[PDB]
Design an enzyme around this catalytic site. Structure first.
Site, short mmCIF file in Angstrom:
data_model
loop_
_atom_site.label_atom_id
_atom_site.label_comp_id
_atom_site.label_asym_id
_atom_site.label_seq_id
_atom_site.Cartn_x
_atom_site.Cartn_y
_atom_site.Cartn_z
N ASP A 395 0.86 -1.17 0.00
CA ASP A 395 0.00 0.00 0.00
C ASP A 395 0.91 1.24 0.00
O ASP A 395 2.12 1.12 -0.16
CB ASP A 395 -0.95 -0.06 1.20
CG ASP A 395 -2.17 0.83 1.04
OD1 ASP A 395 -2.25 1.57 0.04
OD2 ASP A 395 -3.06 0.79 1.92
N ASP A 689 -1.55 -1.41 6.05
CA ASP A 689 -2.74 -1.07 6.82
C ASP A 689 -3.08 0.38 6.56
O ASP A 689 -2.20 1.25 6.53
CB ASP A 689 -2.55 -1.33 8.32
CG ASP A 689 -3.86 -1.31 9.10
OD1 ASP A 689 -4.93 -1.10 8.50
OD2 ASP A 689 -3.81 -1.52 10.33
N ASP A 693 -7.39 -1.74 2.68
CA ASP A 693 -6.61 -2.97 2.70
C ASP A 693 -7.44 -4.24 2.83
O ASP A 693 -6.95 -5.31 2.45
CB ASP A 693 -5.58 -2.92 3.84
CG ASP A 693 -6.23 -2.72 5.21
OD1 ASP A 693 -7.44 -2.45 5.29
OD2 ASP A 693 -5.50 -2.85 6.22
#
Length: 973
Positions: A395, A689, A693
């Site tokens: 991410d 996170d 997610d």
């Protein structure tokens, strides 16, 4: 009736379809392409009511004429007018009609009492074998080894007993709570019903004071900005519109969901808001997500698939030993019952009854160097999958970049000049520039911390003045998203009249400013910033002697700079990953050119490398292949990924094999991106996170979640370190724990077999081995070596080579067979040499097997044998490529040496009362015996090294094929 197979079930689940079709004859049948087992029905409430649950969806279909499955809202071609035709609540007769088809609005869990759980855990086809082995040993031996295998198994079932109850108890302390929430009735009543007795067809009138949420509803009348902390990750109030008249997934911002703690509850049409029900708690958003982690995906690892297949080769090597053994053990004329107990011991000596426990000990040791390190793992067998990772998808919000924003400073402008960026706004002297951004806010100075928006907190501490020389006079215009700006009217002592300090979006505000103040270099300076991955707002002022008189012909002071900086430990890790031939990917719910300058910074796309934007267009037209200049990579977007996944599915594997940056990814569009990369036969890994997610994290193979201590709404890795410095030390704990699950399995197969060979080279001549001896060997030398062996530790440098993962391949089998020709050899050479010795007398054969014991062949075979077990163990544990050198395992070296010394002592001296050895060996050829054991040591280590060099000179996984293919012909034409 009269079709029950209970008479054939009292005389005994390999194939579930071939057994249920005989035990039972459109009624109570369920078989469609997936495991064919959920067979029940209710048909209550005086209707048809096709009730059967599979994982929480009733599939209400018995036929096709008056029946149709997929009970989730059942009316997917719905009208947006229909929820406006049904603003009123459903009638109380019909309220107990839709409740009969739909769910009771509780996603519940079973209680699963102890008999039950136990039964399940025990009736498995290995713990039956640990109830056949213990009941076979106890006829003779036992006592000690049996108590020990039984205890080890009991603690192996009481740990899975309490760990599985706590998974149910934690989910039971979760949702399915109770809350009184008033409704609109059939005609204008409230009645304050509970949040678990409403169905699609009713409404919601939510109280503005308090309430968690009942359900997901369609906002037929109202407007609010609810707390989205447990739904989409963004804990800020998210603007959620009403539903316009005329597909609820398209109307995402028009419908409010479950778990929405209300914050505004703005009516603005009348006294209260109106929101009519869409789904129920069984198949809703976050009602399905909690039920999704109750039926997880099976860990389809080929290591375990060759571990349950290699034991079934040891389960047929027993049957070629327990036919011979009956023949030999009878020829010597035993009186019968012993022939049977003996052939059966051979079966328990060659299928190791504690091999499972050693594998569990290797993995438990794992966890205990991750939980000390910081990474918290809840599923132990997922750790082995961590080393065989070839793709790691990241991410960016709180994962590579910092989560919150910051500032580089202000770029002011004094008479169309652009005086440059200041690194710290206290350095340049006091004026209208630093009075503005330290005060142009609507923050809540409450309980020692200003609480509000994320990005406007950081501008206050940037120059850091005091707060309450000016004072907040009045906020004439609160910040709405329609005007993209906020004006703050503020005065201070020492001034004559207040000024209109205002910040906002650059192009929309500076056009409203004075054109003599804003220059013609305003556009060029804008894309000099926002193309480098910056967030930018402008600031203006005007003196004042309300309405928009405060916003007109302003004096634009300058631009403000915001950007998400990288973490200090995310740059030297992305270099550390792709130097080890595994390649990293970001998935991104933000803008494209924001997430390109990140990938040029941290190290996804290195400098002096190409990258190509893909923008393919709604319409099925071409690709247009946009380049950039500043191997091969290419970035693409969110809606671009939706086009070429369906309009070009035959062209898709030449894009995901090179796709590095995936921007504008929807929270559901990620979980096929982590799944299309699994049928390209990678082994993906999610790590991040943040907001979005949740969908792709569990669908991945190894999912790490950062910045949380201990939570179970997670893929089974959850670090508590808040960096991506953990993703090396999770793929380094799957290499020192998968190249340990060889070295414990191999020692075990080798021990079982050295014991089989000895018991056999010693059922011939009718001289079965003795009880303390077998106990010494097993308990001591195999509880110590296995346990102590599994704790060597991880390395410090990641390698370009992966562990093999397949233990039926030639190298494992070949090492076992050669090390074994050397073992049989040393045990038989010993027997023949003890014979031809001139002082030797033979065993009194025509007596019995365990009263034939103060003799010689057993002493020689047991000594050569114990040394062998310890030498094979030290040989089958090597640590040059993956784990660590062996001399850092102090407990082991100390044990190997002390056991070895007690054994050398038994040989060269006195344990002759116990262990049933020959009373004394007189001559000094105990030394040739010691030499045969030295030849065996040198032997094992050398053989293992020579075989380790095995270049059998005599690319199927799809990714590999594509890459070769692309390499020949590139594809961005």
């Amino acid at each position: 009736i009269p079709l029950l197979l209970f008479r054939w079930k009292p005389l005994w689940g390999e194939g579930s379809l071939e057994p249920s079709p005989q035990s039972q004859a459109g009624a109570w049948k369920d078989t469609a392409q997936l495991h064919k087992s959920e067979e029940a029905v209710s048909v209550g409430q005086k209707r048809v009511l096709r009730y059967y649950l599979f994982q929480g969806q009733r599939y209400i279909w018995i036929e096709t004429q008056q029946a149709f499955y997929q009970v989730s809202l059942l009316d997917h071609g719905r009208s947006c007018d229909d929820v406006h035709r049904s603003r009123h609540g459903l009638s109380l007769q019909d309220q107990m009609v839709r409740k009969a088809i739909y769910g009771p609005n509780v996603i519940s869990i079973p209680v699963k009492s102890y008999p039950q759980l136990l039964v399940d855990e025990a009736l498995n086809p290995y713990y039956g074998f640990q109830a056949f082995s213990i009941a076979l040993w106890l006829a003779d031996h036992y006592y000690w080894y049996a108590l020990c295998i039984f205890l080890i198994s009991s603690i192996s079932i009481c740990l899975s007993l309490y760990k599985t109850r706590k998974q149910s108890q934690t989910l039971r302390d979760m949702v399915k709570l109770s809350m009184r929430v008033c409704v609109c009735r059939p005609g204008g009543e409230e009645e304050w019903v509970d949040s678990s007795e409403l169905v699609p067809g009713d409404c919601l009138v939510l109280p503005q004071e308090g309430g968690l949420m009942p359900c997901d509803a369609a906002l037929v009348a109202g407007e609010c900005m609810v707390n989205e902390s447990s739904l989409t990750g963004e804990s800020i109030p998210v603007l959620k519109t009403a539903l316009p008249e005329g597909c609820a997934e398209t109307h995402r911002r028009h419908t409010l969901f479950c778990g929405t703690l209300i914050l505004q509850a703005r009516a603005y049409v009348g006294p209260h808001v109106l929101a009519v029900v869409t789904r129920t708690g069984f198949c809703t958003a976050k009602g399905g997500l909690v039920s999704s982690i109750l039926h997880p995906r099976p860990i389809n690892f080929k290591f375990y698939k060759h571990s349950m297949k290699f034991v079934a080769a040891l389960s047929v090597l027993a049957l070629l030993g327990t036919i011979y053994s009956i023949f030999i053990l009878y020829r010597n004329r035993v009186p019968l019952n012993e022939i049977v107990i003996r052939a059966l011991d051979l079966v328990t000596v060659v299928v190791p009854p504690a091999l499972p426990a050693a594998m569990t000990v290797c993995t438990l040791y794992a966890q205990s160097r991750l939980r000390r390190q910081g990474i918290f793992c809840i599923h132990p067998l997922r750790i082995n999958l961590g080393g065989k990772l070839q793709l790691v998808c990241f991410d960016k919000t709180g994962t590579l970049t910092e989560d919150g924003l910051d500032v580089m400073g202000v770029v002011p402008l004094k008479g169309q000049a652009f005086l440059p960026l200041v690194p710290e706004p206290r350095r340049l002297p006091v004026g209208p520039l630093l009075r503005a951004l330290a005060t142009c806010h609507a923050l809540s100075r409450l309980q020692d911390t200003p609480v509000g928006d994320p990005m406007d907190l950081k501008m206050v501490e940037s120059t850091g003045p005091q707060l309450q020389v000016p004072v907040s006079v009045l906020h004439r215009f609160p910040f709405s998203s329609a005007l993209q700006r906020m004006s703050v009217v503020v005065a201070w002592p020492g001034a004559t009249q207040p000024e209109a300090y205002v910040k906002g979006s650059p192009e929309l505000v500076a056009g409203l400013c004075n054109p003599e103040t804003v220059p013609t270099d305003f556009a060029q300076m804008l894309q000099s910033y926002t193309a480098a991955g910056y967030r930018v707002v402008a600031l203006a002022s005007k003196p004042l002697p309300t309405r928009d008189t405060v916003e007109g012909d302003l004096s634009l002071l300058g631009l403000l700079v915001m950007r998400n900086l990288l973490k200090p430990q995310t740059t030297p890790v992305i270099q550390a990953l792709r130097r080890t031939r595994i390649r990293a990917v970001m998935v991104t719910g933000d803008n494209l050119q924001t997430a390109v300058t990140v990938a040029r910074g941290c190290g996804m796309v290195a400098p002096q490398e190409h990258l190509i934007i893909v923008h393919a267009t709604g319409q099925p037209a071409s690709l247009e292949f946009l380049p950039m200049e500043s191997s091969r990579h290419l970035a693409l977007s969110g809606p671009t990924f939706g086009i070429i996944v369906k309009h070009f599915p035959k062209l898709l594997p030449k894009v995901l094999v090179q796709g590095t940056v995936f921007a504008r990814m929807a929270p559901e569009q990620k979980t096929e991106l982590v799944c299309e990369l699994q049928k390209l036969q990678y082994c993906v890994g999610m790590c991040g996170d943040g907001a979005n997610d949740c969908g792709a994290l569990k669908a991945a193979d190894v999912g790490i979640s950062l910045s949380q201590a201990e939570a179970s709404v997670v893929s089974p890795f959850t670090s508590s370190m808040a960096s991506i410095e953990c993703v090396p030390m999770v793929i380094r704990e799957g290499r020192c724990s998968l190249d340990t699950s060889f070295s414990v399995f191999k020692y075990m197969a080798l021990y079982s077999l050295t014991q089989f060979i000895s018991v056999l080279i010693l059922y011939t001549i009718n001289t079965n081995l003795g009880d303390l001896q077998f106990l010494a060997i097993d308990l001591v030398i195999t509880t110590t070596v296995a346990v102590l062996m599994s704790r060597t530790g991880p390395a410090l440098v990641l390698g370009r080579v992966r562990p093999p993962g397949a233990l039926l391949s030639v190298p494992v089998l070949s090492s076992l067979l050669l090390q074994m020709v050397l073992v049989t050899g040393v045990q038989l050479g010993g027997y023949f040499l003890t014979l031809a010795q001139p002082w030797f007398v033979p065993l009194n054969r025509t007596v019995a097997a365990p009263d034939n014991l103060p003799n010689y062949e057993n002493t020689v075979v047991f000594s050569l044998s114990s040394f062998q077990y310890l030498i094979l163990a030290a040989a089958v544990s090597k640590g040059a490529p993956f784990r660590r050198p062996l001399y850092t395992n102090v407990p082991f070296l100390v044990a190997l040496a002390l056991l070895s010394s007690v054994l050398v002592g038994l040989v060269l001296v006195l344990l002759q009362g116990p262990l049933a050895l020959r009373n004394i060996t007189d001559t000094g050829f105990k030394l040739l015996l010691l030499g045969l054991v030295t030849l065996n040591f040198v032997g094992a280590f050398m053989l293992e090294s020579v075989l380790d060099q095995c270049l059998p000179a005599c690319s199927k996984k799809r990714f590999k094929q594509l890459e070769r293919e692309l390499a020949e012909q590139p594809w961005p034409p």
